[PDB]
Amino acid sequence: DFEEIPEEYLQ
């Protein structure tokens, strides 16, 4: 149930 985090941190 986690809110998506900004994509910049997953790059």
Place this chain on the structure above:
Amino acid sequence: IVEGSDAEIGMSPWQVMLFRKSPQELLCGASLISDRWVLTAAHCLLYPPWDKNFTENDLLVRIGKHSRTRYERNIEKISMLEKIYIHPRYNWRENLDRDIALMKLKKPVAFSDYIHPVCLPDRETAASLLQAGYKGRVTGWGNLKETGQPSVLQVVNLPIVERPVCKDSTRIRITDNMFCAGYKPDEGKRGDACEGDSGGPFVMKSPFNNRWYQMGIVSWGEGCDRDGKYGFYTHVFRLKKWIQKVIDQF
């Protein structure tokens, strides 16, 4: 955390969430000890019995958080890991002896009202405060009961327990690198860490200098908040020479 309460804003500004990238989920607690170093339990990163062996690129750390699941825009900061260091004598085979690890961040985190490091104890603070009956504080986003999950960070204060009582509560071999905490059945009050709280801090506020020190790391237990059982914590001071060696060398 079982039988705890919601944390106040900024109450535990050294709290860190270890977060898996894919799938996106909470892995563990952790703590901030400087602008570039995070302390956690080794079993949060390496536990071969469960096929757990994370690499740096598998993980993120989220610092400054209060809400468990929300992305706390303008408050939390998310950091990538440069390197993991697991204690070389961490005993994952038997009893989680020396359950400690460090994570170096790729870039320093900016401190704020919500992000601030905890102190690590010196010998004298440890000797003075690690006494049966003295209470510390455990924080985490783990389960609210053994067998759900909290909206925000949870906090519980728990007393350190006499070593013979710790030993007599379990069949697992206890070592000097561990201490246990929790209320006894006859004390009435309750509380414990639980699954998901692993790696988070057990802190004490020194009455000498009014600073918070991390004395323990949530390590292991048998169930959560069971009568006659106690939570076990890595004895941070006993492993501090290794912490300092790592930070000094890397």
Place this chain on the structure above:
Amino acid sequence: EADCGLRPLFEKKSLEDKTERELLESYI
């Protein structure tokens, strides 16, 4: 860190949290 363990919203403002006194009372 020189400033470790002093929380911006508590110790740095001389504000106490709701349960820290429970810890102090245990340090006998």
